[PDB]
Structures are given as C-alpha cells and as structure tokens.
C-alpha cells in the first residue's frame, strides 16, 4: 500500500497555466508543489507529469534510485505501448506481479493499477491469479508479494 | 557433518505435518517441506498464520 | 516442491485417484530400487550435494515425475492382481 | 573410563563437572533377574570374550535437552543418624545442576503494557539499524502490534 | 574457506552471479556497494540532443509522422550506441528518410567510430508524403543526467534530451541461508544484472569491483594530525 | 521499592549500625545495642520453579547504615527497586518480516 | 546534537534526505533549518535511523527510545520435545514419556 | 580528481579518517562496507578461560570477596589485553591479591609482550582475610564466541568465559557537503572509529580495507553457464 499510494500536495491549489513551460517555471520558484494538481492549457495535470517523462520503467526506477524522485510521485511514463500517468511505485508493483507470474501481459490484465493496493484488491488479485494461472503460479506470486511486502515496509520506516 | 548430510538426504522431498491447537478446520493441519534450522523453534511461514 | 501439480490434477477425474496412483507407483519404485523406472538418465531428478549430484531418494517425487511423462498407464481392474507383482519381480 | 571421569569414588558425579544429556549423574546397578542369555547373546559374548555380569546399568542419567554444571550433592542413607526413609529404599541421592540461559530464538519477551513477543531473529550488530553517531538499537518492535 | 563463484548468462544483456558459501554479513557487505556502483559509475553513451527539421518546440507535433516529438525523444532514449575508440568523447549521428517508411535505428546513416546495437528499434512511422531528416548528439558519461541540468546549445532548433548514460538497466541482489554441515546460516549471494548490450553484465561487474578497490586504495597516504 | 521490601527477598538492617564485613556469603554489622549480627546471604538456591534465588551485597565495609537501609539485593532487585528485566534501546518499525 | 557540533559535524546528507520527505508529508514545518527540523522530529520522539546493511537511511523518521522489557518464564513442558519411539503404557498401548 | 586523505587520531582509541572529495554516492558505498567488517571481522584478544584457586565452577563465592565468580567473569569480559608479539597467539596471566583492597586490572602479575590497556578496570573487592588467586587464559580470535562453544580443558577447574575478541567498540561515518571540488554535489566521507586500545583505529581501518579487497578478488574466474 505504501508504494502504490500516490502523493497529493497542497501548494499548487489548482493554479492554471497556459503552457507547461510556465508551470515548470513556477515549480522552480517554489510556488507549486511537484504533485499539486494544476491546470495546464485546459487539461488537468501536475508538475511531475511534465518534468519526468520516462521511456520505460527501467529508466523510471533508475531515476528513483538516484534520489531524483520517490516511488509515490506521479509521473508520465511509457509502459506496455501506452503513455501512462502513474507513479514509479505503481509501475514497480506491476513489475513484481508480472515477473512472479511470468507473463506481464496477463499480469497487467488482473492488476488494478489505478488504486492503492490494499487487503481486498490483493485478495482479489490472488483469486484471479488462481483462476487464470493455477496453484504454483499463485504460490510464486504470494512469495513474491511477501518478499517485496516486508522489504518495502522496512525501507519506508 | 557426515550425518547432518545424511539427515538432509532423508528429509529431501519429504514433508512433516504442522498442527496448532485448536484444530478448527482442516487447515489447522498443513504439510510443509522441512528446512533444517539453527535454534530450538519451529519456523512457520507467515502466509499460513491466518489458517492456523 | 511439486512442480506441475495442476497438470497432475488434470490427468485424473478425482484428486484422490492421483494420490493412489502416485503412492502405488512410488511403492513399486522402492520395491525394485528404482530399476523399474520409466525415466531417461537426464530426466532423473537429482539432489544438489557436495561429492556430486546423486539421484533423488524420494520415491514420491519420481512417481510424480514419471506420471507427467505419460509413460504410465493407470485405471481400475486394468490387469489381474496376482499376475501383477508375480510378473514384475 | 571416559564416561566415568566425573564420577567420584562412590559413583555420584563431582561438583563442578559439566553434564550434557545422557551423562551419568548417579551410578546405579540393578540385578538382571536371572534369565538365560539368548543363544544369540551367548554366541555374541563368545566372539568378544566377555563374561556376562549379573547386574545391569540403571544409573541416573540427565534427560534430553537438559544439562549444565553440577553445583550440589546430597546423600541420605538408611541406617545413618537423623534420617528415616521409605520402606524398601536403601538410600536416595540428589544432584543439583545449574545452567546460564542467555536470550535465544524462541524465548518470550514482554513489557508492562501487554506487548508480547517471541524472539525470532538474533541479528549481528552490523545489520542493526543505528543512529548517525553509530549507536545501534537493541530491539526492533513492529508498530502493527499497537 | 574459498567459495565457488558461478555465472549464468543469457546473451550480452543478462547475468546471474552467485557467490557461495560466505561468512555471515558479507553477502550484504559486497552486494550493496557493487549494486551502487553498477547503477551510478559504469560509463556509457547516451543521446543528449536532437535537431528536428520543421519543429521548434518539445511539446509540438511533426506532420508526415504519426509520432509526436515527445515519442521521438523517448525512442532515442532507448538507443544504445557503442564508441569504437576510447578517445572519442562525443559524436553527431544523422538520420534522413522519406516516403511511407517504417524508420528503424539501423536507418541512421552509417558512421565509422559508432556502432548501433539497436538495428531494428522503432523511432518513427512515416506515412505517404512525409519528410523526416534528423541529427542527434551522442556523448559519453556516467549514470542518469536529465536534460534539465544541461541545456546543450550547438544547433539552432535542438532540444535537450534526458541522458541515460549508464549501460546497466537494472540490478537485483539477495542473500539467503546456505548450510555447510553443522551450520545452516551462511551467506549465499545472488547478483542479477541487466545491461543494454554495449557492455555485457559480466564485464560490467568486473569494472564495478575494479572501481571499488580503486577507491579503497585511497586509504593509503594519511595526513596524521591529532587533537 | 516497596514491592521488594514486603516480599522479604532482600535484606535490610535490623537497627542503626556500621558494616564491618562484606563478602558474597555474609554481611556482618555492629548495631547500636552493641550486638554483632552476621547476615547469611542465600546464594544460588532453587525456587519452586527452578529460578535461582540469589542475594548480593550492596554495602561497603565501614558504611554506616540506618534501620531499614538496604544491605543485600534479592533476585530481580536493583539497589532495592524491583528489577524484572532490562532497559533496552528499542526501535519501532517493521523489519523484513522478522 | 550539541555534542555532535562540538565534535565538528554538521547535518548529514542522509538526514537531510529524510528531512525532505518528513516535510512532504508534513511532519516538520517548512522553512526551518536542518537542526530545527531534527529537533521537531526529536520531540515527536522520532529520530533519523540508518540501515546497518546499506548505510542508506530509512525513508521516514523512526521513534526510538528505552523500553522496559522482561524475559518470561519457560515451563518444562514448553521446551522443544521430539519422539520417534519410546515407552508405551501398560493397559492402553499408547506412547508414554 | 585525486581524493585527499587525512587522519586525525586521538591516542590509541579514537580515530577520525576523512576522504575528500568523492563522487556523489560513494560516502556510503565506501563507509558502510567499511563499517560492516570493522564491527565484525577485526582480529583481537579476549579472556577465554579463568581458574580461581578454590573455585570449582562459575556459581561460586570466594571467602572475603564481595563479587561472586559470575560477576568476576563479567568484569573479566571487559579486560582488554594487547599482544606485542604477533608470533604469540595465546598466553596466560596471573593475579594474586590479599587483604583489604580493590583488585583492579593493573594488579595482574606483569608479563613481557602483553600489556593491559585498561588498568583501572575493576575486578573484585577483597576485604580483610580475602584471597584471590586467579589465572586467565587469553587467546587471539575474531568476532564473538560464547563460553558454550569452545571446549579445551585447560585445567579440571577452569571456567570458559564469553570471548568478545573484536577490539572495535563503535563505528560511525558522516557524509557531508564539500566545496573542495569541481562541481557542487560531491561527497565528504568521514569515518569515526572507536577501539579498546589493543588495535589502533588506523590499524583496524587498514585491516578492514584489506579484508574488503581480499573478498573483492572473489569475483575472478567464474564457472560459466547459460540457458
């Protein structure tokens, strides 16, 4: 839940900008927070979705490792053929479920990548993996959810 | 170390039954493959703690 | 542990018939010290050990492994009972 | 002779010896109840040139999982002043063993507030979370138990 | 004792390295620092600037191409090029194409000191009646440097590009208990490394351990004072 | 303090006096009334539950004590205060599932 | 913190990395200095803590302190038991210690 | 650049070791593995066996002595004794004392090639009539091994004691900013090492770099495989 939850900050209280250049400039003056919801042109967005536009998850998680970013910040990233607005933590969770199950396509099919993972969605995930993949694949998934579950709980302190 | 290897070979593949009382449903008894461990305590996988 | 367990549940109409098949076949393996195996030497299950990789001594593991090859036949009244063990030794 | 090193002159273990499970604490012998040695037993002894004793070892050994070092001894013999003992009992011997038990995995820890826990992992001081000044913590408690 | 050091590879992009058995705490003592070096110190190359004809902005669009400029930069950030001599610090690669074309990376005009290990990498889809001429900076560096810190300015209509210099894509390691007779609590270190192919994971590892022991040799000449 | 006082596991001075002998087995003090009393210290005795009942001296030689002043700590007592455990530096956090 | 300055050490870069997030969630007040934010954590009972396995800090501040902990009694029947074969009772033939 | 080393030691117990400047992220990459082998794998000394003249076992009292043998062994676990002769691995030390005094560590019968580093350490208080005749086996080892492990039988009435060999008492390091450098974001590593005096902090740091570089060479000749 900690890595799949998303930050929402207060500073940019729905400030409006005509171009993303203006919003990135306002972020550099400290007037707008990184994930504060703002309006650029007519679309709703935030600074992080303009600042960070990754080509693939490996670049997004590399940036988080270099301290430029947290797993909970909202960011534009290209994942599986479409341009997603999500957090690196949500991408990391899909990577965990995908590499445990083996197929990241069917993984993306049964993951609810739009909400924080919690007791019920994880429970639902286990059931759908049992239906689609079988016992052993679901057992590998549970061990993977265990490993990264404890590891991230400790990391976040 | 010669007979610890011997014990490791009889254990290979075998399973033991782990039971916590009260046995309320059948999952109160489950079968695991034993891994030899330092200490005096049985080590129980955390995902089966609900059932037990 | 037991890979291919889902495929083993599919080979039988009842999960318990699988256990009888695995157990009975494992008993035949022990009686003949794995000479009557249907496995080729490269698909014999091994045990990672110093001084080399020996054969896995677990007869239940072999029986499940053999059953996944289709090289075994199982069913009721498939052959006379006395003639079975008398002709297997 | 090795299994008898820490036994004194009269068969009971010396004060200060370290006893591990199975070791003899008080030596004792009981008559076998005269029966023929089995023919296999007869041929066995004929091979190793051993003449059968008429007495069997029934000595007090230390039970499994228990041990320590002997700190006390006590002997009460029938026919000696001050003591009267059960009928049919010639004498009783008591041995006291002490052990230092340091904290180990499985031991149960608790605070005055009802927090319970079993030690699950003993960790090297190097792996322990520590303050900037290098001081490591002693125990890690999960907040989910609160 | 002396542990066995195994290696299980798959092409030039994957490597599994297990070191076992090892005294307690050392799997973590070796793992993290090597992991930190692999993700931040291994030198490589990356796209750092692109000139796009007929385009003047990073958020605009380009006719004759189905992709926008943002999708182009993303595909170029996945381009891996190999320099043939160590003396080369930078280069400029050129792309020119026309017609209804599936433009790959092997469609760059072949250079001498530069090889492309992404021959069939999608950059842009050209349709009937579209034009695309392109030239791109390629420098060498270390780690991950965004286009925000360095606004490179050698052309007129060039755009800075996030510089993914590091050839290492991903590093994962873990230690588990391996037993040696009586004791069942020893370190079994497994190291998992992904690279872009320009350098193999094995030859990314020996460089990391070489950079580490190089930094350890700095503890030799002290300026001894005492307060 | 009062718990160890009424449990009679520690040892206290019967009267005002001065300590004259201190070792692991006995504490001798000369009281006002002129009497010399040596107090035996119970050492590594076995309790009903097998726990070691052990008393340890907490006074020095020549120390002048008042009546009721502590002489020896009993089990689970530190300078006359109930000592049921240890004061350990704790960190409240998850840790890899352990 | 004063003893640490007297020894000639400022605020660690890992501590400032923790102080950044404690501000993102709103555990320290924005605008104050690193020493002041460390003090706002310390009187919340929380401190910056380093992982002895990596040297990296845990991402959030972590309340440490002294707690009184006891070791509880261990009855004889609670110790590790294990039988293969042993005595059996007279009338009922069931395993017997 | 070329990083500058400096070492500001204090006696034989405290030592600061600065390194400047380092690439962003090398403070922890060097300091933490250094901290891990320091606290764990620095060879040292400790008492490993004790004989007291009229004492049969650890749960004993000595006439005229305030402390019991358990306390004495507790105090002996704190005795730090350095060896001057590296050819010497083990030794034995004598201590006889009488009457009303407070037997401290320095009251041991002196001996060549060995030196008590904390002579003010308390051992036992002897009152009038109290006699303490003691000799202690002192070995060289590494890490921590309880009495319950090693079994020697040095004497029939000898008592094995817990061995805390490592001479290092505490390790810390501090990653700070440095303007001594080309760019702004470089690291400033500063190791902080506390020892018991048997091994100076600089000796321990040198031995730590050796053990790390020794273990680093384990990534050498792999047993290759591939799927």
């Amino acid at each position: 839940y900690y890595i799949t939850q998303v930050r929402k900050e207060k500073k940019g209280a729905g400030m409006a900008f005509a171009t993303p250049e203006e919003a990135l400039a306002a972020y550099e003056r400290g007037e707008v927070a990184l994930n504060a919801p703002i309006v650029v042109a007519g679309r709703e967005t935030s600074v992080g979705r303009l600042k960070f536009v990754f080509a693939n998850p490996d670049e997004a998680l590399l940036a988080v490792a270099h301290g430029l970013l947290d797993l909970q910040d909202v960011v534009t990233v290209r994942y599986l053929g479409r341009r997603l607005e999500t957090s690196p933590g949500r991408i990391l969770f899909a990577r965990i479920v995908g590499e445990a199950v083996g197929d990241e396509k069917v993984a993306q099919e049964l993951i609810q990548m739009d909400v924080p993972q919690e007791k019920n969605s994880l429970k639902d995930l286990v059931y759908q993996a049992f239906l689609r993949l079988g016992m052993e694949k679901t057992a590998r998934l549970l061990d993977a959810l265990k490993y990264y579950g404890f590891t991230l709980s400790t990391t976040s302190g | 170390d010669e007979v610890w290897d011997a014990l490791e070979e009889v254990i290979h593949g075998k399973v033991v039954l782990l039971n916590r009382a009260p046995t309320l449903h059948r999952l109160g008894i489950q079968a695991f493959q034993p891994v030899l461990v330092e200490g005096q305590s049985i080590q129980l996988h955390p995902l089966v703690c609900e059932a037990f | 542990a037991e890979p291919g367990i889902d495929k083993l549940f599919g080979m039988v109409d009842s999960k318990y018939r699988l256990t009888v098949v695995v157990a009975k076949r494992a008993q035949q393996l022990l009686r003949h010290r794995f000479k009557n195996t249907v496995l080729e030497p490269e698909e014999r299950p091994k045990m990672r050990t110093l001084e080399g990789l020996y054969d896995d001594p677990n007869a239940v593991t072999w029986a499940m492994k053999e059953l996944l090859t289709g090289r075994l036949f199982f069913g009721e009244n498939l052959v006379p009972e006395d003639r079975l063990q008398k002709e297997m030794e | 002779e090795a299994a008898l090193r820490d036994l004194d002159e009269e068969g009971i273990v010396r004060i200060g010896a370290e006893v591990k499970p199975g070791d003899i604490l008080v030596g004792r012998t009981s008559f076998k109840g005269e029966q023929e040695p089995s023919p296999e037993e007869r041929l066995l002894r004929s091979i190793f040139g051993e003449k059968a004793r008429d007495v069997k070892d029934t000595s007090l050994r230390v039970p499994p999982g228990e041990g320590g070092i002997v700190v006390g001894r006590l002997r009460l013999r029938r026919g000696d002043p001050g003591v009267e003992l059960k009928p049919g009992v010639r004498e009783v011997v008591r041995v006291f063993v002490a052990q230092k038990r340091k904290l180990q995995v499985g031991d149960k820890l608790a605070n005055r507030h009802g927090n319970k826990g079993v030690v699950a992992k003993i960790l090297p001081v190097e792996d322990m979370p520590h303050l900037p000044d290098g001081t490591p913590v002693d125990v890690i408690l999960n907040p989910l138990g609160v | 004792k002396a542990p066995v050091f195994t290696a299980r590879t798959q092409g030039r992009h994957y490597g599994e390295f297990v070191l076992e058995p090892l005294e307690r705490g050392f799997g973590v003592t070796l793992g993290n620092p090597l992991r930190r070096i692999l993700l931040s110190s291994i030198p490589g190359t990356a796209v750092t600037s692109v000139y796009i004809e007929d385009v003047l902005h990073e958020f605009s669009t380009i006719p004759g191409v189905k992709e926008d400029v943002v999708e182009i930069i993303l595909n170029l950030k996945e381009l891996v090029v190999r320099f043939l001599d160590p003396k080369m610090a930078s280069t400029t690669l050129i792309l020119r194409a026309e017609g209804p074309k599936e433009v790959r990376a092997g469609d760059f005009t072949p250079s001498a000191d530069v090889e492309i290990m992404n021959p069939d990498l999608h950059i842009a889809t050209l349709e009937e009646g579209g034009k695309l001429y392109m030239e791109v900076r390629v420098d060498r560096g270390v780690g991950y440097v965004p286009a925000e810190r360095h606004g490179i300015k050698d052309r007129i209509n060039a755009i800075p590009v996030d510089a993914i210099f590091s050839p290492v894509r991903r590093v994962a390691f873990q230690v588990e208990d391996t037993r040696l007779g009586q004791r069942t609590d020893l370190d079994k270190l497994t190291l998992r490394i992904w690279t872009d192919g320009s350098v193999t994971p094995l030859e990314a590892l020996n460089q990391a351990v070489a950079i580490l022991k190089e930094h350890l040799n700095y503890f030799a000449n002290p300026e001894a004072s005492l307060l | 303090e009062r718990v160890v006082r009424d449990s009679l596991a520690a040892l206290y001075a019967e009267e005002d006096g001065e300590v004259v002998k201190v070792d692991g087995t006995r504490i001798a003090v000369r009281y006002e009334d002129g009497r010399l009393v040596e107090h035996p210290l119970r050492r590594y005795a076995r309790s009903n539950q097998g726990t070691a009942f052990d008393q340890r001296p907490r006074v020095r030689v020549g120390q002048r004590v008042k009546k009721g002043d502590l002489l020896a700590d009993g089990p689970a007592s530190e300078e006359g205060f109930l000592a049921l455990g240890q004061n350990v530096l704790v960190a409240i956090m998850p840790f890899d599932g352990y | 913190f004063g003893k640490r300055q007297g020894e000639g050490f400022g605020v660690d870069k890992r501590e400032k990395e923790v102080l950044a997030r404690a501000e993102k969630l709103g555990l320290v007040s924005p605008g104050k200095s690193p020493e002041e934010q460390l003090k706002e954590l310390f009187d919340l009972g929380k401190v910056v803590l380093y992982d002895g396995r990596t040297g990296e800090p845990f991402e959030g501040p972590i309340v440490v302190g002294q707690m009184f902990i006891m070791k509880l009694y261990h009855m004889v029947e609670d110790k590790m038991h294990a039988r293969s074969t042993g005595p059996y009772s007279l009338i009922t033939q069931q395993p017997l210690g």
Side-chain angles (χ1 to χ4, degrees), chain A, chain B, chain C, chain D, chain E, chain F, chain G:
Chain A
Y1 180 89
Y2 218 77
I3 64 153
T4 53
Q5 183 64 83
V6 136
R7 283 180 184 166
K8 174 176 286 300
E9 281 160 326
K10 296 177 181 295
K11 195 182 286 187
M15 287 168 61
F17 304 90
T19 57
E21 327 294 320
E22 295 168 325
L24 281 155
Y27 173 62
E28 292 301 330
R29 288 192 301 283
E31 308 167 0
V32 179
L34 183 64
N35 297 289
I38 56 182
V39 182
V40 169
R43 299 296 215 279
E44 178 183 353
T45 184
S46 61
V47 170
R49 315 178 191 190
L50 310 168
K51 183 172 179 175
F52 303 93
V53 180
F54 300 106
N56 48 47
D58 285 341
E59 184 201 345
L61 296 179
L62 171 64
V64 175
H66 279 297
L68 307 178
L69 196 62
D70 286 335
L71 289 174
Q72 298 80 358
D73 290 314
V74 186
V75 153
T76 305
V77 49
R78 181 176 68 185
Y79 180 50
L80 297 183
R82 66 175 89 108
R83 190 172 303 177
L84 296 174
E85 279 185 347
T86 188
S87 77
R90 298 228 223 260
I91 298 288
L92 178 57
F93 176 78
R95 186 205 243 179
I96 295 167
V97 181
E99 286 169 327
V101 156
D103 179 85
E104 49 182 343
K105 271 196 189 299
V106 73
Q108 183 53 231
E109 223 187 42
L110 42 73
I111 297 166
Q112 314 172 16
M113 275 195 60
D114 48 338
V115 280
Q117 296 305 325
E118 40 97 6
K119 184 183 173 69
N120 290 323
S121 63
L122 288 174
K123 173 187 174 183
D124 291 334
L125 208 180
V126 178
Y127 178 80
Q128 300 300 146
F130 193 99
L131 251 52
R132 298 290 299 274
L133 287 344
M135 277 183 304
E136 181 167 3
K137 311 285 269 180
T138 308
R140 291 192 190 94
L141 171 66
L142 291 169
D143 276 319
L145 297 178
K146 159 184 68 72
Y147 177 83
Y148 296 90
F150 296 134
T151 292
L152 298 167
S153 312
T154 308
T155 285
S156 58
Chain B
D1 313 342
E2 202 181 7
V3 294
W4 288 124
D5 296 335
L7 182 68
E8 186 78 25
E9 299 179 22
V10 320
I11 288 303
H12 194 283
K14 282 184 182 292
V15 297
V16 298
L17 303 189
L18 262 60
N19 167 251
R20 157 157 196 282
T23 314
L24 298 191
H25 48 235
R26 68 179 182 182
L27 273 355
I29 302 171
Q30 299 184 35
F32 302 82
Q33 294 191 348
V35 168
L36 299 179
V37 136
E38 294 295 336
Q40 310 270 292
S41 296
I42 300 154
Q43 295 185 9
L44 183 68
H45 191 282
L47 284 177
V48 308
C49 292
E50 265 194 12
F52 292 106
Chain C
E2 287 91 284
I5 185 59
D6 274 308
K7 295 178 175 62
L8 289 168
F9 284 112
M11 302 184 55
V12 292
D13 48 331
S14 179
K15 59 193 290 188
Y16 306 117
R17 191 183 300 271
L18 170 62
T19 303
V20 175
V21 167
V22 174
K24 286 185 173 179
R25 174 57 177 170
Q27 292 179 347
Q28 305 174 353
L29 269 34
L30 296 167
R31 175 68 184 90
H32 303 298
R33 298 182 177 179
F34 300 92
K35 301 305 178 179
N36 61 327
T37 178
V38 305
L39 293 179
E40 311 291 295
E42 59 270 6
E43 42 188 354
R44 279 165 160 77
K46 303 293 182 179
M47 180 175 57
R48 184 73 60 177
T49 315
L50 68 340
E51 313 161 59
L53 273 64
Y54 221 75
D55 285 331
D56 187 23
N58 190 302
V60 181
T61 299
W62 284 64
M64 297 174 177
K65 188 71 177 301
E66 295 182 334
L67 215 52
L68 287 169
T69 73
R71 295 195 274 266
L72 296 181
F73 288 150
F74 58 92
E76 300 188 35
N77 309 125
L78 197 130
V79 95
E81 186 76 15
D82 193 317
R83 313 308 304 271
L84 174 57
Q85 86 281 2
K86 171 188 171 60
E87 209 75 18
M88 190 175 259
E89 288 116 28
Chain D
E1 63 172 7
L4 270 52
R5 286 190 300 253
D6 295 334
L7 271 48
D8 60 17
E9 336 87 22
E10 47 191 6
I12 104 180
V13 68
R14 65 175 182 88
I15 286 185
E18 186 186 33
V19 284
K20 291 178 170 54
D23 288 335
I24 317 196
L25 299 174
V26 180
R28 192 185 61 176
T29 55
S30 301
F31 284 126
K32 287 191 187 172
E34 45 182 6
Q35 289 286 12
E36 41 126 356
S38 70
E40 293 82 4
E41 191 174 359
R42 207 118 60 198
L43 177 55
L44 225 198
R45 291 162 177 163
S46 185
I47 292 172
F48 295 82
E50 279 202 0
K51 299 171 71 175
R53 293 286 296 270
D54 56 342
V55 90
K56 62 185 173 184
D57 169 41
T58 59
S59 45
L60 168 63
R61 304 177 188 270
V62 33
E66 298 174 357
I69 62 183
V70 181
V71 303
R73 294 167 37 183
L74 196 138
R75 191 164 185 169
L76 307 172
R77 323 179 66 181
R78 186 189 67 191
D80 281 339
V83 54
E84 297 299 326
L85 193 43
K86 304 300 179 180
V89 181
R90 300 184 61 193
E91 71 187 36
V92 294
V93 182
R94 292 210 264 256
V95 179
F96 293 80
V97 179
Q99 40 176 322
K100 279 168 52 190
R101 299 185 189 171
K102 37 184 55 190
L103 197 55
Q104 61 174 356
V105 168
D107 288 343
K108 188 179 172 176
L109 299 179
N111 62 21
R112 296 162 290 172
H113 305 276
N115 202 111
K116 288 195 279 185
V118 157
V119 180
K121 186 70 172 181
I122 303 173
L123 219 51
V125 63
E126 356 140 8
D127 300 339
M128 198 66 40
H130 57 92
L131 299 170
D133 69 336
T135 295
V137 305
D138 294 327
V139 47
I140 312 173
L141 289 183
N142 199 315
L144 291 169
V146 184
Chain E
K1 212 183 177 181
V4 307
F5 173 60
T6 67
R8 309 176 61 198
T9 69
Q10 172 60 279
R12 304 174 50 88
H13 62 276
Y14 191 29
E16 286 192 352
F17 306 93
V18 183
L19 187 51
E20 153 197 19
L22 200 43
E23 266 296 336
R24 72 170 187 180
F26 270 82
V28 196
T29 302
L30 300 172
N32 287 289
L34 296 181
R35 167 193 157 89
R36 299 184 60 83
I37 296 173
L38 286 160
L39 298 175
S40 61
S41 296
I42 300 300
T45 53
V47 160
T48 57
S49 182
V50 195
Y51 171 75
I52 47 207
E53 293 277 348
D54 321 331
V55 182
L56 287 74
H57 190 213
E58 206 271 343
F59 286 74
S60 57
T61 179
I62 174 169
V65 192
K66 294 199 294 189
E67 294 83 359
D68 67 332
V69 49
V70 172
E71 190 73 12
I72 301 295
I73 298 180
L74 261 41
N75 294 284
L76 296 171
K77 292 164 64 174
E78 300 185 16
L79 180 69
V80 50
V81 303
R82 189 173 71 189
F83 287 178
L84 289 191
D85 64 71
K87 294 184 185 297
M88 166 162 284
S90 64
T91 316
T92 293
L93 276 65
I94 320 285
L95 215 190
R96 176 176 287 272
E98 73 281 356
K101 186 61 181 301
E102 173 80 3
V103 177
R104 304 177 182 270
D107 302 18
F108 270 66
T109 179
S111 180
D113 302 324
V114 170
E115 181 185 344
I116 296 178
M117 303 191 66
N118 270 140
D120 47 341
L121 175 73
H122 184 72
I123 278 83
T125 323
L126 309 195
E127 40 195 348
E128 183 50 87
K131 59 172 54 183
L132 210 195
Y133 168 80
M134 195 158 60
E135 75 179 20
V136 49
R137 284 282 172 281
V138 170
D139 316 336
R140 89 161 57 202
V142 282
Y144 181 75
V145 185
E148 175 168 317
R149 322 251 165 253
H150 182 190
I152 177 166
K153 31 167 179 301
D154 286 338
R155 281 290 305 209
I156 173 70
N157 292 285
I159 298 173
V161 172
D162 303 326
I164 171 177
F165 289 121
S166 173
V168 179
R169 304 300 198 186
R170 174 186 181 182
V171 174
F173 81 92
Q174 60 163 7
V175 303
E176 61 182 8
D177 292 342
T178 178
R179 61 162 280 266
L180 189 66
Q182 172 81 236
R183 47 194 310 182
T184 60
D185 49 350
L186 291 178
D187 280 22
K188 172 171 169 292
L189 171 59
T190 301
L191 188 47
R192 233 152 62 159
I193 300 177
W194 288 261
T195 60
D196 58 13
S198 64
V199 297
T200 209
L202 175 56
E203 82 187 337
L205 174 61
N206 309 117
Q207 202 170 348
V209 316
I211 295 176
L212 181 53
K213 59 177 54 182
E214 158 162 324
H215 277 76
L216 294 172
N217 294 336
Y218 298 143
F219 290 70
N221 198 327
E223 260 83 342
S225 46
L226 44 99
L227 195 152
Chain F
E1 182 271 336
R2 188 87 141 81
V3 170
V4 328
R5 184 70 70 116
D6 286 315
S7 66
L8 297 188
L11 190 35
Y12 304 83
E14 312 173 351
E15 208 98 346
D16 297 324
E18 175 189 350
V19 185
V20 300
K21 295 178 173 183
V22 169
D23 74 329
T25 64
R26 53 105 223 256
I27 292 178
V29 295
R30 180 185 59 90
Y31 292 109
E32 299 169 325
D33 49 338
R35 287 204 326 270
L36 183 68
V37 181
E38 72 161 358
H39 296 291
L41 300 193
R42 199 177 296 272
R43 302 298 313 212
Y44 301 105
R46 186 186 185 276
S47 66
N48 278 340
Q49 289 70 38
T51 55
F53 187 94
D54 195 305
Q55 294 172 324
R56 288 173 286 186
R58 300 291 151 183
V59 290
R60 52 149 128 99
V61 179
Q63 177 173 345
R64 302 195 178 275
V65 295
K66 297 285 298 177
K67 187 175 67 176
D69 255 311
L70 182 73
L71 296 180
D73 270 334
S77 67
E78 183 189 34
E79 309 297 325
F81 298 95
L82 194 64
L84 260 36
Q86 312 278 10
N87 295 289
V88 289
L89 204 65
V90 66
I92 299 171
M93 63 182 298
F95 198 87
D96 290 348
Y98 291 100
Chain G
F1 193 92
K3 171 187 177 178
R4 170 186 181 181
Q5 281 180 330
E7 295 167 345
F9 296 88
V11 178
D12 198 292
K13 278 165 65 173
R14 293 164 294 175
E15 302 181 49
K16 290 190 283 188
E17 191 165 342
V18 167
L19 292 172
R21 330 179 63 144
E23 181 175 342
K24 300 282 177 54
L25 67 91
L27 217 46
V28 283
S29 56
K32 289 196 180 181
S33 73
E35 170 177 1
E36 294 166 345
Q37 292 189 329
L38 280 184
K39 192 173 185 179
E40 297 182 63
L41 255 28
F42 199 88
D43 68 332
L44 295 166
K46 305 178 177 177
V47 300
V48 182
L49 213 60
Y50 297 157
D51 181 18
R53 322 200 298 273
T54 63
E56 296 162 303
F58 299 107
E59 300 183 347
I62 303 191
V63 31
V64 314
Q66 291 184 292
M67 179 187 295
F68 192 62
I69 292 185
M70 311 163 288
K71 185 174 79 162
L72 299 189
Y73 178 75
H74 196 81
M75 299 208 69
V76 185
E77 199 72 4
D78 299 331
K79 76 175 181 180
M80 169 178 67
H81 302 159
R83 162 199 269 250
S84 69
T85 284
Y88 304 102
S89 170
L90 177 65
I91 58 176
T92 111
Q93 281 296 327
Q94 298 193 9
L96 203 52

